[PDB]
Amino acid sequence: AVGNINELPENILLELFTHVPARQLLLNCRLVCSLWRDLIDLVTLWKRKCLREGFITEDWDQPVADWKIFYFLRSLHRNLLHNPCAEEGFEFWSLDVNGGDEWKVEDLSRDQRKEFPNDQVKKYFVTSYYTCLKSQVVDLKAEGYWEELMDTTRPDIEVKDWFAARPDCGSKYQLCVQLLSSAHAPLGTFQPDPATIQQKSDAKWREVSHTFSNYPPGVRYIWFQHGGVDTHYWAGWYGPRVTNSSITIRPP
Amino acid sequence: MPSIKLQSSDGEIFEVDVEIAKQSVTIKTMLEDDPVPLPNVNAAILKKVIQWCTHHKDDPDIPVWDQEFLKVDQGTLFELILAANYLDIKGLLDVTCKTVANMIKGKTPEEIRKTFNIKNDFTEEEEAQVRKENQWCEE
């Protein structure tokens, strides 16, 4: 007979901890006693929660400074931008400027669907003949990134976006992404160099990409805005098309 | 039909459909003209194991059934986990381990200690050191 949970083998205790939500393991269980604290501070517990949930496999071959951190961040990882391809119209986006005949939503060709290294981009947003811009603000707390995680760990923040514009297009693609404080005060801004945007304006789908690292403490929101600003020479009925926008937070 | 014989730790022999008693990867391997003996599993515990396995022989969030079956005292749970571990029956290892993990959910350190009758090992300065290391993870 086993007359106490702590007379179980270490390997089994690890196995049990595996099924305790991680936040709770850390806050409550490291306090229960020193065995539990020692067991929960082993790499192997987290290493194998990660395995039971697909975040890694047997061939994992990269140094990980802290597995607890790694674990949480992989567990929270997903696109924080809602309705990034236009599966539900303009829901979640502020048409900050909506000139001309306005922002539209339309279907991608089956040929253009391949240009994404996902099978699951079936639509895009497209701008009119005057400037059109839209926005979405990400609320980090509300998406599971509590404050001290942001401040303590400063995990990398990766932003992507895809657009297609002719070199000749009547409105130029534009992209601004800012990290914001609890006051909504900027703590780092990104806009791609306009030269390398014009370089990407052949008529094909191009990605643009950036990672914020070592940003300051205080980051509570990210503001993301994009669209086309009118050049003032007519070249058609629509400007840049954009889709498959994303923001994620990756293990740094 | 055909059936293999299994001896528990305390004498009692048992027979079981050979393919039901191969949810254990341990015995599965041993088959590869006596009774196979099981040092770590006693009668009370071996009977529930074959039971859990017979119910689960036809099978491709803890199922209702598994929850009622497992409404036993801590001590027999623990021995259930152990047999599962020793016999290497993943399915059973998982629900038992979960069921115990569900008793840790929602509780303070003192409340956990009390559920399992664990003595606080810790000095108060060791406790304070642990809260410090848990700073990054609090609100």
Residue numbers in the entry:
A (entry chain A): 2 to 253
B (entry chain B): 1 to 32, 42 to 69, 84 to 162
Paper passage:
The SCF complex, one of the best characterized E3 enzymes, contains four subunits: Skp1, Cul1, RING-finger protein (Rbx1), and F-box protein. F-box proteins provide substrate specificity to the SCF complex, and consist of the common F-box domain interacting with Skp1, a linker region, and a substrate-binding domain (SBD). The sugar-binding activity of FBG3/FBXO44 has not been detected, although SBD in FBG3 has a 52%, 68%, and 43% sequence identity to that in Fbs1, Fbs2, and Fbs3, respectively.
The structure of the human Skp1–FBG3 complex was determined by the molecular replacement method at a resolution of 2.6 Å. The FBG3 structure consists of an N-terminal 310 helix (310−1), an F-box domain (residues 9–50), a linker domain (residues 51–78), and SBD (residues 79–255). However, the comparison of the substrate-binding pocket of Fbs1 (Phe177, located in the loop β3-β4, and Tyr279 and Trp280, located in the loop β9-β10) and the corresponding residues of FBG3 (Tyr130, Tyr234, and Trp235) are not well superposed. The side chains of Tyr234 and Trp235 in FBG3 are oriented in opposite directions to those of Tyr279 and Trp280 in Fbs1. Although the sequence similarity between FBG3 and Fbs1 is high, i.e., 133 out of 255 residues in FBG3 are identical with those in Fbs1, four loops (β2-β3, β5-β6, β7-β8, and β9-β10) exhibit different conformations. The hydrogen bond network in FBG3 is found between the loops β5-β6 (residues Asp169, Cys170, and Gly171) and β9-β10 (residues Thr232 and Tyr234), whereas Fbs1 has only a single hydrogen bond between the loops β5-β6 (Gly218) and β9-β10 (Ser277), suggesting that the interaction of these two loops in FBG3 is tighter than that in Fbs1. The carbohydrate-binding pocket is formed by the residues in the loops β3-β4 and β9-β10 in Fbs1, whereas distinct hydrogen-bond networks among the four loops β2-β3, β5-β6, β7-β8, and β9-β10 in FBG3 prevent it from forming the carbohydrate-binding pocket shown in Fbs1.
